[PDB]
């Protein structure tokens, strides 16, 4: 048995780990998704070839995140209850005749390691953020960089050939460049790396052609092996689809490369004025657009703005984002540049307009714009606000610019390297097959 333990609830942690698990099953391993009782009760299971098992974060009936909006407080409770119930699960599983061969875990759950190790179970950390950000956190954890991290430290990393781009103040990861803003997330980001060297394996959802210096450093410093992009094999053109979702039918009616997909992710919240600038920007661009506005956010949307969006947009609460990104009508993606989103754009060859909020997004956005060349980043005004004119300018810059073809050329180029990495003999595929063999 292979246990897979993502950060619970966090869809940006769970899909990639599930896809890695399908490849393990292809090689003969048996994967089990481990998740909270709440999420189990309130979500269909993944299905074959996965078993499911449960632990508790304390809130088996309510959402604990909702209950404990203070993040330090939630993490503390997840740790107390998760660690206890994971220990219980490792024993109950052995007693049922399914002893865990390895626990693959998100090291945003640092406690998972100690519990597995004390139960005698091999451990494999699964990093779901890019090498470039991972390694900076790593440098802090290893006491080679002090907090706060500065553009000067970043420039040393670039000068040493470790980072492939020079990060300015808006590009350094804010959790360690401005730790005061987010104390719990700083500590969580850094503590990923505490004890990592005791792991049997360390894995990262990226591919080495995308971040070659950063992946090489992560490997020689932390034994990190690239196993991504961890996406369904169909999108990767890997031989060894079409849904009925209504928004796909709308998209079927649009001309080729005409549509802007717009999504700011599952976590971040936008206030009314910010939604107003984003949505007016979209309407003002004159492009068709599929704008994802979550159920828990849509009450911030005025009737007027909503009516303006009807002329050539469609607003939905959720879309099948991979399917949309693979669709012929889709011309670019205005994205917060979460890592999962960015990798999905890359595998589909879709150029990006980046509008980062935090975590790894500012750094990712800088790579998009400078090293990868597959898009542009929105420039906030002097006081930190995104204006509708900037949203509109960037959409039009990517879709009608003199550099329209540069963004497309790079996105296509990187699409092909991403597919190669995950096909048989590719750099990521090889690390997957090695891991598979190790535990079979
Ligand atoms: O309508 C929808 C909306 C989303 N999805 C899918 O949900 C996932 C969103 O992941 P992404 O990394 O872009 O956003 P999120 O989990 O906020 O990322 C956090 O977690 C990431 C991983 O640690 C991190 O890089 C990032 O900074 C964090 F914000 C991605 O697989 C989408 O395809 C969808 O299918 N339909
Ligand atoms: C609330 C939360 C959400 C997740 O998604 C976001 C990306 C990393 C992150 C620290 C975490 C894994 C963990 C904390 C998060 C808050 O930043």
From Swiss-Prot:
Induction: Induced by exposition to gamma ray. Pfam families: UDPGT. Coiled coil: none annotated. Keywords: Detoxification, Glycosyltransferase, Nucleotide-binding, Transferase. GO terms for molecular function: nucleotide binding; quercetin 3-O-glucosyltransferase activity; quercetin 7-O-glucosyltransferase activity; UDP-glycosyltransferase activity. The active site is at residues 13, 106. The keyword Transferase applies. It comes from the Eukaryota. This is UDP-glycosyltransferase 79. The lineage of its organism: Eukaryota, Viridiplantae, Streptophyta, Embryophyta, Tracheophyta. UDP-alpha-D-glucose binds at residues 13, 128, 266, 318-319, 336, 339-341, 344, 360-361. Changing residue 336 to A: No effect on activity. Its EC number is 2.4.1.-.
């Amino acid at each position: 048995q292979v246990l897979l333990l993502p950060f619970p609830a966090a869809q940006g942690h769970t899909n990639p780990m599930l896809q890695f698990g399908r490849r393990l099953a292809y090689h003969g391993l048996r994967p089990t998704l481990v998740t909270t009782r709440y999420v189990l009760s309130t979500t269909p299971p993944p299905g074959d070839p996965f078993r499911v098992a449960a632990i508790s974060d304390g809130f088996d009936d309510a959402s604990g995140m909702a209950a404990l909006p203070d993040p330090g407080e939630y993490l503390r409770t997840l740790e107390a209850h998760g660690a206890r119930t994971l220990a219980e699960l490792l024993l109950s599983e052995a007693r049922a005749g399914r002893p865990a061969r390895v626990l693959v875990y998100d090291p945003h759950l640092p406690w998972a390691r100690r519990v597995a190790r004390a139960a005698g179970v091999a451990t494999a950390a699964f990093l779901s953020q890019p090498c470039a950000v991972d390694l900076i956190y790593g440098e802090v954890c290893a006491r080679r960089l002090a907090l706060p991290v500065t553009p000067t430290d970043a420039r040393g990393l670039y000068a040493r050939g470790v980072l492939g781009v020079e990060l300015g103040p808006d590009d350094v990861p804010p959790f360690v460049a401005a730790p005061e803003l987010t104390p719990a997330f700083c500590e969580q980001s850094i503590e990923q790396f505490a004890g990592l060297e005791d792991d049997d394996d360390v894995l990262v959802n990226s591919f080495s052609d995308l971040e070659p210096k950063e992946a090489a450093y992560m490997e020689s410093t932390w034994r990190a092996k690239t196993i991504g992009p961890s996406l369904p094999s169909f999108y990767l053109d890997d031989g060894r689809f079409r849904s009925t979702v209504p928004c796909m039918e709308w998209l079927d009616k649009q001309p080729p490369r005409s549509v802007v997909l717009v999504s700011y992710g599952t976590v971040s919240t936008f206030d009314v004025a910010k939604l107003e600038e984003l949505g007016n920007g979209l309407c003002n661009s004159g492009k068709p657009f599929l704008w994802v506005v979550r159920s828990n956010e849509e009450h911030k949307l005025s009737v007027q703005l909503r009516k303006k969006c009807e002329k050539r947009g469609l607003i939905v609460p959720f879309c099948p984002q991979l399917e949309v990104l693979a669709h012929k009508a889709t011309g670019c993606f205005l994205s917060h540049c979460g890592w999962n989103s960015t990798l999905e754009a890359i595998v589909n060859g879709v150029p990006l307009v980046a509008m980062p909020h935090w975590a790894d997004q500012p750094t990712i956005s800088k790579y998009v714009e400078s090293l990868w060349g597959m898009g542009v980043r929105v420039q906030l005004d002097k006081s930190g606000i995104l204006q509708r004119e900037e949203v509109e300018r960037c959409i039009r810059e990517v879709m009608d610019g003199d550099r329209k073809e540069d963004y497309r050329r790079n996105a296509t180029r990187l699409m092909k390297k991403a597919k190669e990495s995950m096909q048989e003999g590719g750099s990521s595929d090889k690390n997957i097959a090695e891991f598979a063999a190790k535990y079979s």
